[PDB]
Amino acid sequence: MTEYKLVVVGAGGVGKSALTIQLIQNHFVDEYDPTIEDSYRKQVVIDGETCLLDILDTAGQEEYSAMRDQYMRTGEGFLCVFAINNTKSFEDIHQYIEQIKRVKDSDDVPMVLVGNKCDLAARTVESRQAQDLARSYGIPYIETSAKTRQGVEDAFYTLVREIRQH
Ligand SMILES: Nc1nc2c(ncn2[C@@H]2O[C@H](COP(=O)(O)OP(=O)(O)NP(=O)(O)O)[C@@H](O)[C@H]2O)c(=O)[nH]1
Ligand SMILES: [Ca+2]
Ligand SMILES: [Mg+2]
Ligand SMILES: [Mg+2]
């Protein structure tokens, strides 16, 4: 059984915890409790193979930026999340990737760029704008809603594939 170490990263309130919790636990967290750092673990079959997903729910608040370095070393693949109604989080996520590539000293780090909250109509990040950013990194772009589960399995499982195809 292969184990995959996924880390979910991005700015505060973009839906990292709701995305993780929707995948692992199949419900939507409506309330907003900022995360320090939580861990989840779950046995899944992906492309015929049983594997263990280890998922680190990280902090979006800047006050815990200090602990980013240590989880960027451990993690095998990184789900890079912004909210399509939050232009600042799209600008920010660009920064998170550069930090990962730095900390890991590779421009070949398994990653998926995720535009979350795609159920909201207050979109200020157009899909083409995120596509352009993903293209420059060689990584997939996938839109999701943690509310409706749209794209949630696809996003996380794409990241496993990126890691396992690394
Ligand atoms: N409509 C909608 N709301 C969402 C979605 N994902 C998260 N939210 C909402 O946005 C708020 C913040 O979500 P949360 O997952 O806690 O964000 P976070 O990125 O983990 N924040 P932190 O970095 O502080 O831990 C919550 O009220 C949650 O219900 C989504 O896909 N759609
Ligand atoms: Ca709920
Ligand atoms: Mg959270
Ligand atoms: Mg615009």
Q: What is the resolution of this structure in A?
A: 2.0
Rounded Cα–Cα distance for residues 40 and 150 (Å) = 20
Q: Whose Cα sits closest to atom 23 in ligand 1?
A: 60
Structure tokens at 31: 């309330």
Beta strands in the chain (DSSP E): 2-10, 37-46, 49-58, 77-83, 111-116, 141-143
Encoding tokens for residue 13?
Answer: 């309130």
For residue 61 and ligand 1, the question of a CB distance below 6 A is answered with yes
Rounded Cα gap, residues 100 and 73, in angstroms: 8
Residue whose token pair is 């370095």: 69
* Residue 108, ligand 1, Cβ within 6 A: no
Cα separation of 113 and 157, whole Å? 13
Sign of CA dihedral 150, 82, 106, 57: negative
Instruction: Tell me the CA–centroid distance for residue 53 and ligand 3, in Å.
Output: 18
Binding site membership: which residues?
A: 13-18, 29-35, 59-60, 116-119, 145-147
Give the C-alpha separation, 138 to 122, whole Å. 28
Angle between helix 127-137 and helix 87-104 axes, rounded to 10 deg: 10
Give the burial class of 117: count Cβ atoms within 10 A of its Cβ; 0-12 exposed, 13-18 middle, 19 or more buried. Answer: buried
CA dihedral of 83, 156, 55, 116, whole degrees rounded to 10: 10
- What tokens does 1 get? 């059984």
User: DSSP character for 90?
Assistant: H
Q: How was this structure determined?
A: X-ray
Q: Which of 105, 99, 126 is nearest to 115 (CA)?
A: 126
Q: Return the best residue to mutate from 31, 32, 39, 152 for the ligand 1 pocket (most ligand atoms within 8 A of CB).
A: 32
Which structure tokens are listed for 47?
Answer: 């492309």
Dihedral, CA atoms, 53, 104, 65, 130, nearest 10 degrees?
A: -80
**C-alpha 32 to ligand 1 mean position (Å):** 6
**Which CB contacts under 8 angstroms, 24+ apart, belong to 24-27?**
24/53, 24/55
In order of their start, the domains of the chain are: 2-165 (3.40.50.300)
Q: Measure 27 CA to ligand 2 centroid, in angstroms.
A: 6
Separation of alpha carbons 134 and 3, rounded Å: 26
31 CA from centroid of ligand 3 (Å): 10
Find the ligand nearest to 61 CA.
1
The answer to whether 154 touches 113, Cβ cutoff 8 Å, is no
Q: Beta-carbon neighbour count of residue 2 at 10 Å?
A: 11
**Cβ 159 vs Cβ 152: under 8 Å:** no
